[PDB]
User: What shape does this take?
Amino acid sequence: GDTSPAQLIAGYEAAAGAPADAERGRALFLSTQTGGKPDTPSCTTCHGADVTRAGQTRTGKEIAPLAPSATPDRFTDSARVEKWLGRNCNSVIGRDCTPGEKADLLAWLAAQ
Ligand code: HEC
Ligand SMILES: [C-]#N
Assistant: This one.
């Protein structure tokens, strides 16, 4: 792609002013939120709790696994991460994810 996962995470860490924390990323990803859309209370609603397995849309269509260990080119395009997170941070949390949240989430996801 046009970037590496490390370059993406570094960019978010610089915007947040702090290093990524993958344990915080894991906790946010598995969390149940109440501020966003009713049908999507968690990132796991579509991607599952184990990101090495396929996820499912809200209609049951298969979503390729988010883990780079199962799907190779994950997190190698800066616009694609922004485009999807720009949509589903709002759907799950009710607001855009901050750059620190994006750093933490990708740091956890990139190691799976
Ligand atoms: C269903 C409505 C979703 C919810 C809720 C969340 N995500 Fe998602 N995500 C969804 C799709 C259909 C896709 C694209 C399909 C694909 O195979 O990529 C994505 C994509 C992402 C990405 C980008 C991956 C890349 O290749 O760079 C990321 C980083 C991601 N999803 C993470 C993520 C998080 C952190 C969520 C909660 C805030 C979340 N997703 C919610 C579908 C859905
Ligand atoms: C997904 N975003």
Remarks:
- Residues 29, 40, 43, 45-47, 57-58, 63-64, 66, 74-75, 80-81, 84-85, 88-89, 91-92, 105 surround heme C (ligand 1) (CB under 6 Å).
- The CA atoms of residues 40 and 107 lie 22 Å apart.
